PDB file of C-alpha atoms in Angstrom:
ATOM      1  CA  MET E   1       0.000   0.000   0.000  1.00 46.18           C
ATOM      2  CA  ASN E   2       1.395   3.387  -1.090  1.00 50.38           C
ATOM      3  CA  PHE E   3       1.052   6.631   0.882  1.00 47.68           C
ATOM      4  CA  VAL E   4       1.408   9.576  -1.513  1.00 46.32           C
ATOM      5  CA  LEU E   5       1.808  13.163  -0.276  1.00 45.35           C
ATOM      6  CA  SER E   6       0.590  15.943  -2.590  1.00 42.94           C
ATOM      7  CA  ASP E   7       0.153  19.756  -2.493  1.00 41.21           C
ATOM      8  CA  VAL E   8      -2.057  20.173  -5.584  1.00 42.05           C
ATOM      9  CA  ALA E   9      -5.855  20.186  -5.828  1.00 39.81           C
ATOM     10  CA  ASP E  10      -7.301  16.953  -7.248  1.00 40.34           C
ATOM     11  CA  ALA E  11     -11.074  16.562  -7.559  1.00 38.41           C
ATOM     12  CA  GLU E  12     -11.071  12.808  -8.309  1.00 38.38           C
ATOM     13  CA  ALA E  13      -8.614  11.965  -5.529  1.00 39.17           C
ATOM     14  CA  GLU E  14     -10.540  14.112  -3.035  1.00 35.65           C
ATOM     15  CA  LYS E  15     -13.829  12.493  -4.142  1.00 36.37           C
ATOM     16  CA  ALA E  16     -12.284   9.016  -3.688  1.00 38.55           C
ATOM     17  CA  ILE E  17     -11.663   9.896  -0.013  1.00 39.61           C
ATOM     18  CA  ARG E  18     -14.877  11.877   0.632  1.00 35.63           C
ATOM     19  CA  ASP E  19     -17.361   9.364  -0.827  1.00 35.83           C
ATOM     20  CA  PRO E  20     -16.498   6.352   1.374  1.00 36.57           C
ATOM     21  CA  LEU E  21     -16.265   8.598   4.471  1.00 37.74           C
ATOM     22  CA  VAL E  22     -19.763   9.927   3.689  1.00 37.94           C
ATOM     23  CA  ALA E  23     -20.984   6.326   3.172  1.00 38.65           C
ATOM     24  CA  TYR E  24     -19.376   5.289   6.472  1.00 35.56           C
ATOM     25  CA  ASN E  25     -20.996   8.216   8.300  1.00 37.45           C
ATOM     26  CA  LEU E  26     -24.414   7.416   6.816  1.00 36.85           C
ATOM     27  CA  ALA E  27     -24.151   3.767   7.908  1.00 40.31           C
ATOM     28  CA  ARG E  28     -23.024   4.673  11.422  1.00 43.34           C
ATOM     29  CA  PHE E  29     -24.772   7.962  12.248  1.00 45.93           C
ATOM     30  CA  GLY E  30     -27.825   7.836   9.908  1.00 47.48           C
ATOM     31  CA  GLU E  31     -29.039  10.398   7.335  1.00 48.53           C
ATOM     32  CA  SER E  32     -27.383  13.828   7.445  1.00 51.41           C
ATOM     33  CA  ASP E  33     -30.206  15.554   5.527  1.00 55.64           C
ATOM     34  CA  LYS E  34     -27.552  17.927   4.116  1.00 57.99           C
ATOM     35  CA  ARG E  35     -29.258  20.724   2.234  1.00 62.64           C
ATOM     36  CA  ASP E  36     -27.730  23.912   0.857  1.00 62.44           C
ATOM     37  CA  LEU E  37     -28.848  27.294   2.157  1.00 62.75           C
ATOM     38  CA  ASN E  38     -27.715  30.347   0.179  1.00 62.08           C
ATOM     39  CA  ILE E  39     -28.854  33.953   0.058  1.00 62.37           C
ATOM     40  CA  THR E  40     -27.654  36.054  -2.837  1.00 61.10           C
ATOM     41  CA  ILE E  41     -27.755  39.821  -2.884  1.00 58.29           C
ATOM     42  CA  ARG E  42     -28.534  40.747  -6.504  1.00 59.39           C
ATOM     43  CA  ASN E  43     -28.564  44.116  -8.298  1.00 59.48           C
ATOM     44  CA  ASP E  44     -30.948  45.380 -11.018  1.00 60.66           C
ATOM     45  CA  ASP E  45     -29.309  43.170 -13.676  1.00 57.84           C
ATOM     46  CA  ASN E  46     -29.436  40.007 -11.505  1.00 61.73           C
ATOM     47  CA  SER E  47     -25.680  40.025 -10.663  1.00 63.75           C
ATOM     48  CA  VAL E  48     -24.613  38.569  -7.296  1.00 62.64           C
ATOM     49  CA  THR E  49     -22.819  41.280  -5.290  1.00 63.24           C
ATOM     50  CA  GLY E  50     -22.671  39.408  -1.966  1.00 63.71           C
ATOM     51  CA  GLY E  51     -24.659  37.197   0.395  1.00 61.55           C
ATOM     52  CA  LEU E  52     -24.460  34.108   2.563  1.00 63.27           C
ATOM     53  CA  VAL E  53     -23.391  30.542   1.736  1.00 63.30           C
ATOM     54  CA  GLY E  54     -24.199  27.708   4.117  1.00 66.88           C
ATOM     55  CA  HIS E  55     -26.121  24.511   4.722  1.00 66.60           C
ATOM     56  CA  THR E  56     -28.184  22.600   7.232  1.00 65.24           C
ATOM     57  CA  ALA E  57     -27.226  19.062   8.332  1.00 68.93           C
ATOM     58  CA  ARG E  58     -28.010  16.923  11.401  1.00 70.81           C
ATOM     59  CA  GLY E  59     -30.228  19.634  12.908  1.00 74.40           C
ATOM     60  CA  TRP E  60     -27.769  22.539  12.621  1.00 72.78           C
ATOM     61  CA  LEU E  61     -27.198  25.491  10.315  1.00 69.73           C
ATOM     62  CA  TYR E  62     -23.566  26.139   9.343  1.00 69.97           C
ATOM     63  CA  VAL E  63     -22.845  29.546   7.832  1.00 68.91           C
ATOM     64  CA  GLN E  64     -19.777  29.085   5.618  1.00 68.97           C
ATOM     65  CA  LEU E  65     -19.402  32.456   3.876  1.00 64.64           C
ATOM     66  CA  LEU E  66     -20.902  35.890   4.371  1.00 67.61           C
ATOM     67  CA  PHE E  67     -19.998  38.929   2.313  1.00 69.73           C
ATOM     68  CA  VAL E  68     -21.555  42.385   2.370  1.00 71.31           C
ATOM     69  CA  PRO E  69     -20.650  44.727  -0.544  1.00 72.82           C
ATOM     70  CA  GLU E  70     -18.662  47.823   0.477  1.00 70.49           C
ATOM     71  CA  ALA E  71     -21.533  50.202  -0.436  1.00 66.61           C
ATOM     72  CA  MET E  72     -23.944  48.341   1.860  1.00 66.79           C
ATOM     73  CA  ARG E  73     -21.871  48.172   5.055  1.00 66.17           C
ATOM     74  CA  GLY E  74     -22.929  49.608   8.431  1.00 66.44           C
ATOM     75  CA  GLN E  75     -26.577  49.091   7.464  1.00 68.99           C
ATOM     76  CA  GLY E  76     -27.639  45.851   9.216  1.00 67.64           C
ATOM     77  CA  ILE E  77     -27.086  43.769   6.085  1.00 65.29           C
ATOM     78  CA  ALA E  78     -24.951  41.033   7.653  1.00 63.03           C
ATOM     79  CA  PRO E  79     -27.520  40.667  10.488  1.00 63.23           C
ATOM     80  CA  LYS E  80     -30.285  40.607   7.818  1.00 60.67           C
ATOM     81  CA  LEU E  81     -28.544  37.720   6.045  1.00 63.70           C
ATOM     82  CA  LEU E  82     -28.148  35.894   9.365  1.00 64.35           C
ATOM     83  CA  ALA E  83     -31.831  36.502  10.182  1.00 64.15           C
ATOM     84  CA  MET E  84     -32.947  35.154   6.785  1.00 65.52           C
ATOM     85  CA  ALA E  85     -30.753  32.054   7.235  1.00 66.68           C
ATOM     86  CA  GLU E  86     -32.006  31.465  10.796  1.00 68.62           C
ATOM     87  CA  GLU E  87     -35.635  31.806   9.691  1.00 67.28           C
ATOM     88  CA  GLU E  88     -35.080  29.168   6.963  1.00 60.45           C
ATOM     89  CA  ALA E  89     -33.137  26.894   9.345  1.00 62.17           C
ATOM     90  CA  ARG E  90     -35.952  27.079  11.912  1.00 63.11           C
ATOM     91  CA  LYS E  91     -38.407  26.186   9.132  1.00 60.40           C
ATOM     92  CA  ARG E  92     -36.279  23.146   8.284  1.00 59.65           C
ATOM     93  CA  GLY E  93     -36.617  22.108  11.953  1.00 60.69           C
ATOM     94  CA  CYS E  94     -33.025  22.970  13.003  1.00 57.22           C
ATOM     95  CA  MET E  95     -31.994  23.275  16.664  1.00 54.37           C
ATOM     96  CA  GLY E  96     -29.268  25.883  16.216  1.00 53.21           C
ATOM     97  CA  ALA E  97     -26.609  27.558  14.064  1.00 52.62           C
ATOM     98  CA  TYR E  98     -22.861  27.777  14.137  1.00 50.57           C
ATOM     99  CA  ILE E  99     -20.297  30.027  12.563  1.00 47.92           C
ATOM    100  CA  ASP E 100     -16.586  30.835  12.603  1.00 50.14           C
ATOM    101  CA  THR E 101     -14.378  33.846  11.893  1.00 49.29           C
ATOM    102  CA  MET E 102     -10.927  35.429  12.068  1.00 48.45           C
ATOM    103  CA  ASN E 103     -12.329  38.969  11.650  1.00 49.40           C
ATOM    104  CA  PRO E 104     -12.838  40.947  14.910  1.00 48.03           C
ATOM    105  CA  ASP E 105     -15.581  43.060  13.267  1.00 47.73           C
ATOM    106  CA  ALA E 106     -17.463  39.961  12.061  1.00 45.09           C
ATOM    107  CA  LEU E 107     -17.048  38.461  15.569  1.00 40.86           C
ATOM    108  CA  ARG E 108     -18.668  41.563  17.126  1.00 42.86           C
ATOM    109  CA  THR E 109     -21.518  41.394  14.588  1.00 39.72           C
ATOM    110  CA  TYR E 110     -22.132  37.714  15.375  1.00 38.91           C
ATOM    111  CA  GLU E 111     -22.062  38.284  19.113  1.00 39.71           C
ATOM    112  CA  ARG E 112     -24.502  41.228  18.900  1.00 38.62           C
ATOM    113  CA  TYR E 113     -26.785  39.034  16.727  1.00 41.04           C
ATOM    114  CA  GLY E 114     -26.902  36.400  19.499  1.00 41.07           C
ATOM    115  CA  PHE E 115     -24.092  33.904  18.792  1.00 41.09           C
ATOM    116  CA  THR E 116     -21.976  32.791  21.742  1.00 42.39           C
ATOM    117  CA  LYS E 117     -18.349  31.699  21.546  1.00 39.18           C
ATOM    118  CA  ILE E 118     -17.645  28.005  21.857  1.00 39.87           C
ATOM    119  CA  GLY E 119     -13.851  28.074  21.419  1.00 37.97           C
ATOM    120  CA  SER E 120     -10.904  29.709  19.667  1.00 36.79           C
ATOM    121  CA  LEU E 121      -7.333  29.170  18.548  1.00 35.55           C
ATOM    122  CA  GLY E 122      -4.382  31.354  17.670  1.00 39.00           C
ATOM    123  CA  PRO E 123      -2.546  33.284  16.937  1.00 36.67           C
ATOM    124  CA  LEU E 124      -2.505  32.743  13.202  1.00 35.58           C
ATOM    125  CA  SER E 125       0.746  33.692  11.348  1.00 37.46           C
ATOM    126  CA  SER E 126      -0.863  37.021  10.610  1.00 39.52           C
ATOM    127  CA  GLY E 127      -1.810  37.614  14.291  1.00 41.25           C
ATOM    128  CA  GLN E 128      -5.569  37.041  14.303  1.00 40.93           C
ATOM    129  CA  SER E 129      -7.443  34.203  15.982  1.00 46.10           C
ATOM    130  CA  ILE E 130     -10.147  31.810  14.780  1.00 47.22           C
ATOM    131  CA  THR E 131     -13.333  31.856  16.919  1.00 46.04           C
ATOM    132  CA  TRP E 132     -16.237  29.391  16.688  1.00 46.19           C
ATOM    133  CA  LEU E 133     -19.657  30.434  17.864  1.00 42.27           C
ATOM    134  CA  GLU E 134     -23.103  28.845  18.292  1.00 46.60           C
ATOM    135  CA  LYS E 135     -26.714  30.066  18.454  1.00 49.42           C
ATOM    136  CA  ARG E 136     -29.277  27.655  19.818  1.00 49.70           C
ATOM    137  CA  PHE E 137     -32.882  28.120  18.707  1.00 51.20           C
TER     138      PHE E 137
ATOM    139  CA  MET B   1     -31.373  45.325  -4.049  1.00 49.09           C
ATOM    140  CA  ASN B   2     -32.834  41.793  -4.059  1.00 48.03           C
ATOM    141  CA  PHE B   3     -32.210  39.161  -1.374  1.00 47.35           C
ATOM    142  CA  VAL B   4     -32.801  35.704  -2.872  1.00 49.78           C
ATOM    143  CA  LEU B   5     -32.996  32.563  -0.717  1.00 49.41           C
ATOM    144  CA  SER B   6     -32.017  29.263  -2.366  1.00 49.92           C
ATOM    145  CA  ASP B   7     -31.513  25.597  -1.345  1.00 50.88           C
ATOM    146  CA  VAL B   8     -29.678  24.365  -4.464  1.00 50.35           C
ATOM    147  CA  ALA B   9     -25.936  24.231  -5.145  1.00 48.29           C
ATOM    148  CA  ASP B  10     -24.719  26.967  -7.508  1.00 49.74           C
ATOM    149  CA  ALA B  11     -21.015  27.207  -8.355  1.00 51.79           C
ATOM    150  CA  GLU B  12     -21.165  30.642 -10.038  1.00 50.90           C
ATOM    151  CA  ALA B  13     -23.289  32.209  -7.297  1.00 50.01           C
ATOM    152  CA  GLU B  14     -21.048  30.745  -4.581  1.00 48.24           C
ATOM    153  CA  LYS B  15     -17.939  31.974  -6.449  1.00 49.18           C
ATOM    154  CA  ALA B  16     -19.474  35.474  -6.724  1.00 46.26           C
ATOM    155  CA  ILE B  17     -19.641  35.578  -2.900  1.00 46.73           C
ATOM    156  CA  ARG B  18     -16.343  33.780  -2.153  1.00 45.11           C
ATOM    157  CA  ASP B  19     -14.089  35.794  -4.491  1.00 42.94           C
ATOM    158  CA  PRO B  20     -14.731  39.284  -3.052  1.00 41.53           C
ATOM    159  CA  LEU B  21     -14.561  37.914   0.522  1.00 38.41           C
ATOM    160  CA  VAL B  22     -11.160  36.374  -0.300  1.00 36.48           C
ATOM    161  CA  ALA B  23     -10.065  39.702  -1.866  1.00 37.58           C
ATOM    162  CA  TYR B  24     -11.286  41.576   1.223  1.00 35.01           C
ATOM    163  CA  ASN B  25      -9.416  39.193   3.536  1.00 37.22           C
ATOM    164  CA  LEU B  26      -6.211  39.531   1.503  1.00 39.45           C
ATOM    165  CA  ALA B  27      -6.399  43.343   1.644  1.00 36.09           C
ATOM    166  CA  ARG B  28      -7.088  43.387   5.381  1.00 35.52           C
ATOM    167  CA  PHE B  29      -5.203  40.394   6.811  1.00 37.23           C
ATOM    168  CA  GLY B  30      -2.451  39.867   4.173  1.00 35.31           C
ATOM    169  CA  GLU B  31      -1.512  36.711   2.219  1.00 33.39           C
ATOM    170  CA  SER B  32      -3.089  33.451   3.402  1.00 30.56           C
ATOM    171  CA  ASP B  33      -0.486  31.246   1.672  1.00 27.48           C
ATOM    172  CA  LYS B  34      -3.252  28.633   1.243  1.00 27.39           C
ATOM    173  CA  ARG B  35      -1.738  25.419  -0.046  1.00 24.43           C
ATOM    174  CA  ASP B  36      -3.368  22.009  -0.367  1.00 22.94           C
ATOM    175  CA  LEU B  37      -2.051  19.058   1.617  1.00 25.47           C
ATOM    176  CA  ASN B  38      -3.363  15.617   0.639  1.00 28.99           C
ATOM    177  CA  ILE B  39      -2.190  12.083   1.315  1.00 25.85           C
ATOM    178  CA  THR B  40      -3.692   9.328  -0.780  1.00 24.50           C
ATOM    179  CA  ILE B  41      -3.539   5.674   0.131  1.00 23.32           C
ATOM    180  CA  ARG B  42      -3.180   3.837  -3.195  1.00 22.38           C
ATOM    181  CA  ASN B  43      -3.310   0.120  -4.053  1.00 20.52           C
ATOM    182  CA  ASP B  44      -1.246  -1.837  -6.620  1.00 21.70           C
ATOM    183  CA  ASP B  45      -3.222  -0.360  -9.543  1.00 20.22           C
ATOM    184  CA  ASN B  46      -2.888   3.253  -8.289  1.00 20.53           C
ATOM    185  CA  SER B  47      -6.518   3.511  -7.032  1.00 16.21           C
ATOM    186  CA  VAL B  48      -7.201   5.799  -4.050  1.00 16.82           C
ATOM    187  CA  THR B  49      -8.702   3.723  -1.217  1.00 15.34           C
ATOM    188  CA  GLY B  50      -8.485   6.388   1.508  1.00  9.41           C
ATOM    189  CA  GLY B  51      -6.266   9.100   2.969  1.00  8.04           C
ATOM    190  CA  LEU B  52      -6.254  12.646   4.277  1.00  7.79           C
ATOM    191  CA  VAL B  53      -7.469  15.896   2.695  1.00  8.79           C
ATOM    192  CA  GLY B  54      -6.429  19.233   4.154  1.00  8.56           C
ATOM    193  CA  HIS B  55      -4.499  22.448   3.686  1.00  8.74           C
ATOM    194  CA  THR B  56      -2.182  24.908   5.358  1.00  6.25           C
ATOM    195  CA  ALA B  57      -3.059  28.624   5.617  1.00  8.65           C
ATOM    196  CA  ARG B  58      -1.950  31.467   7.918  1.00  5.91           C
ATOM    197  CA  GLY B  59       0.473  29.200   9.797  1.00  3.93           C
ATOM    198  CA  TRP B  60      -1.957  26.358  10.560  1.00  3.68           C
ATOM    199  CA  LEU B  61      -2.752  22.922   9.174  1.00  2.00           C
ATOM    200  CA  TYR B  62      -6.463  22.102   8.839  1.00  2.00           C
ATOM    201  CA  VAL B  63      -7.304  18.433   8.351  1.00  2.00           C
ATOM    202  CA  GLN B  64     -10.620  18.357   6.472  1.00  2.00           C
ATOM    203  CA  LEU B  65     -11.146  14.657   5.712  1.00  2.10           C
ATOM    204  CA  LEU B  66      -9.545  11.444   6.891  1.00  5.53           C
ATOM    205  CA  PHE B  67     -10.639   7.992   5.806  1.00  5.43           C
ATOM    206  CA  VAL B  68      -9.033   4.643   6.564  1.00  5.64           C
ATOM    207  CA  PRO B  69     -10.240   1.645   4.478  1.00  7.71           C
ATOM    208  CA  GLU B  70     -12.045  -1.053   6.488  1.00  8.33           C
ATOM    209  CA  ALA B  71      -9.265  -3.631   5.884  1.00  8.62           C
ATOM    210  CA  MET B  72      -6.629  -1.280   7.322  1.00 10.80           C
ATOM    211  CA  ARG B  73      -8.312  -0.264  10.589  1.00  6.18           C
ATOM    212  CA  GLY B  74      -6.838  -0.801  14.071  1.00  6.18           C
ATOM    213  CA  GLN B  75      -3.339  -0.606  12.579  1.00  6.03           C
ATOM    214  CA  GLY B  76      -2.127   2.958  13.300  1.00  7.38           C
ATOM    215  CA  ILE B  77      -3.080   4.174   9.827  1.00  9.78           C
ATOM    216  CA  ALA B  78      -5.057   7.254  10.882  1.00 10.52           C
ATOM    217  CA  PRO B  79      -2.175   8.297  13.202  1.00  9.18           C
ATOM    218  CA  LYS B  80       0.253   7.626  10.299  1.00  9.60           C
ATOM    219  CA  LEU B  81      -1.731   9.986   8.062  1.00 10.07           C
ATOM    220  CA  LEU B  82      -1.759  12.611  10.824  1.00 10.59           C
ATOM    221  CA  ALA B  83       2.003  12.176  11.328  1.00 10.74           C
ATOM    222  CA  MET B  84       2.688  12.588   7.591  1.00  8.94           C
ATOM    223  CA  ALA B  85       0.515  15.733   7.486  1.00  9.93           C
ATOM    224  CA  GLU B  86       2.172  17.198  10.601  1.00  9.82           C
ATOM    225  CA  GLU B  87       5.649  16.528   9.200  1.00 12.22           C
ATOM    226  CA  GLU B  88       4.734  18.384   5.970  1.00 13.23           C
ATOM    227  CA  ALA B  89       3.052  21.225   7.901  1.00 16.66           C
ATOM    228  CA  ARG B  90       6.153  21.662  10.077  1.00 16.78           C
ATOM    229  CA  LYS B  91       8.248  21.772   6.891  1.00 18.06           C
ATOM    230  CA  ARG B  92       5.988  24.524   5.548  1.00 17.44           C
ATOM    231  CA  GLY B  93       6.741  26.466   8.761  1.00 14.22           C
ATOM    232  CA  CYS B  94       3.313  25.958  10.415  1.00 14.15           C
ATOM    233  CA  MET B  95       2.727  26.620  14.126  1.00 12.96           C
ATOM    234  CA  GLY B  96       0.008  24.028  14.690  1.00 12.47           C
ATOM    235  CA  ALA B  97      -2.861  21.897  13.371  1.00 14.20           C
ATOM    236  CA  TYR B  98      -6.569  21.762  13.941  1.00 15.44           C
ATOM    237  CA  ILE B  99      -9.266  19.224  13.313  1.00 15.06           C
ATOM    238  CA  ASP B 100     -12.934  18.510  13.998  1.00 15.66           C
ATOM    239  CA  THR B 101     -15.163  15.453  14.353  1.00 14.69           C
ATOM    240  CA  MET B 102     -18.544  14.022  15.337  1.00 18.18           C
ATOM    241  CA  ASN B 103     -17.147  10.472  15.679  1.00 17.09           C
ATOM    242  CA  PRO B 104     -16.224   9.390  19.254  1.00 13.86           C
ATOM    243  CA  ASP B 105     -13.663   6.884  17.897  1.00 12.66           C
ATOM    244  CA  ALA B 106     -11.985   9.539  15.720  1.00 12.23           C
ATOM    245  CA  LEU B 107     -12.006  11.897  18.748  1.00 12.99           C
ATOM    246  CA  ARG B 108     -10.164   9.274  20.847  1.00  7.70           C
ATOM    247  CA  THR B 109      -7.638   8.741  18.032  1.00  7.65           C
ATOM    248  CA  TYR B 110      -6.992  12.490  17.768  1.00  8.69           C
ATOM    249  CA  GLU B 111      -6.611  12.901  21.509  1.00  5.56           C
ATOM    250  CA  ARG B 112      -4.167   9.963  21.771  1.00  6.18           C
ATOM    251  CA  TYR B 113      -2.192  11.489  18.853  1.00  7.71           C
ATOM    252  CA  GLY B 114      -1.788  14.745  20.822  1.00  7.16           C
ATOM    253  CA  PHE B 115      -4.701  17.019  19.834  1.00  5.87           C
ATOM    254  CA  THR B 116      -6.469  18.886  22.629  1.00  3.98           C
ATOM    255  CA  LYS B 117     -10.111  19.947  22.589  1.00  7.05           C
ATOM    256  CA  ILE B 118     -10.830  23.607  22.022  1.00  3.54           C
ATOM    257  CA  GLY B 119     -14.647  23.487  22.069  1.00  2.00           C
ATOM    258  CA  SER B 120     -17.756  21.503  21.158  1.00  2.00           C
ATOM    259  CA  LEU B 121     -21.442  21.791  20.369  1.00  5.10           C
ATOM    260  CA  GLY B 122     -24.442  19.500  20.438  1.00  3.70           C
ATOM    261  CA  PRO B 123     -26.322  17.476  20.448  1.00  8.57           C
ATOM    262  CA  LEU B 124     -26.814  17.039  16.731  1.00 10.60           C
ATOM    263  CA  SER B 125     -30.245  15.697  15.582  1.00 12.91           C
ATOM    264  CA  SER B 126     -28.684  12.265  15.539  1.00 17.14           C
ATOM    265  CA  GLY B 127     -27.299  12.624  19.110  1.00 15.66           C
ATOM    266  CA  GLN B 128     -23.574  13.122  18.529  1.00 19.12           C
ATOM    267  CA  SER B 129     -21.559  16.267  19.188  1.00 18.70           C
ATOM    268  CA  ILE B 130     -19.054  18.228  17.100  1.00 19.48           C
ATOM    269  CA  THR B 131     -15.636  18.684  18.786  1.00 23.98           C
ATOM    270  CA  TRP B 132     -12.818  20.962  17.587  1.00 23.53           C
ATOM    271  CA  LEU B 133      -9.268  20.203  18.578  1.00 23.57           C
ATOM    272  CA  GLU B 134      -5.820  21.794  18.172  1.00 27.30           C
ATOM    273  CA  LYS B 135      -2.198  20.600  18.214  1.00 25.95           C
ATOM    274  CA  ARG B 136       0.471  23.241  18.599  1.00 26.53           C
ATOM    275  CA  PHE B 137       3.926  22.449  17.225  1.00 26.47           C
TER     276      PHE B 137
END
């Protein structure tokens, strides 16, 4: 058996590791019910300028990406995206949400919104920390 | 400005949110130096049967996926994959590694290896918890 180290992206190799791990997790822990949850912010010509990317699985919303366009900052837009995601997650029957960040301004936004820190690590090479937060419904 | 909720995967929409967030993070927090780190376990005909998928960024190794084939379990293979990843991460000048799991047997493996819990949440709908762990070099 050969153990091969690589530093390049490879879709087929990554799939060949992900698929059996997913199958293993299904067999052991039951259905994940993984379902995407995105909110796009779109201008007059339907272009995506920002939004939220996440998903619900195993009763929890994970927010993966959130971007607010420069022109729309300081205007409750990030909280609006979080509120739209939470509303949809509650509809799907979720028990809570989680989120992570290295940005102190995003961290403040999430905390004001109602997330509570669950752990952190750092520093990163650039001096920031990663913080994980949850919000139980 | 239109806020559009969706529950289907969309590469172009997700890219249109990820790219400016990456550009924002570069401008504010400097270079990430994101670099893939994979280890494939390959049989005699070069097929991937398992391995580790991760990356290094901002001084830290993140292990995203780890799968050991059924025939190779209870044989120090998951620790071997972690050791190969750590060796490469140290070479790249990383300060530490982090990892997460909902599998109590994977959690035990990671703890024995030398990871230490940084936080957790749960329960999930299926009854398990998510645990995050770190290992500082």
